[PDB]
Design a protein around this ligand. Structure first.
Ligand SMILES: [Cu+2]
Length: 105
């Protein structure tokens, strides 16, 4: 896997690690649809709206199988730590029109 997952379950926005690299989700969009980070960084998505959202990576992207993240409720978060350079596209399972990518340098 080209990513590790600190927590399988979503957690509270207030529980996000200091100096976290945050991508907010609001208005049915990932606020930073093109995020650039370095190898070893942890990316955290935070849902700021009542409609649940997730991040879903298709099979072959971060590993052999698809990585379908859990649904985040309002003010819930979810992290992924990227261990290899590359460009990783993702989308929201229930709302596939919501798309983003993280470019690991
Ligand atoms: Cu969504």
């Amino acid at each position: 896997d080209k990513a590790t997952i600190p927590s399988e379950s979503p957690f509270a926005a207030a529980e996000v690690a200091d100096g976290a690299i945050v991508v907010d989700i609001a208005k049915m969009k990932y606020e930073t649809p093109e995020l650039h980070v370095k190898v070893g960084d942890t990316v955290t998505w935070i849902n700021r709206e009542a409609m649940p959202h997730n991040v879903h990576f298709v099979a072959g992207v971060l590993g052999e199988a698809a990585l379908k993240g859990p649904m985040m409720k309002k003010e819930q978060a979810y992290s992924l730590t990227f261990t290899e350079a590359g460009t990783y596209d993702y989308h929201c399972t229930p709302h596939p029109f919501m798309r983003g990518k993280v470019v690991v340098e």
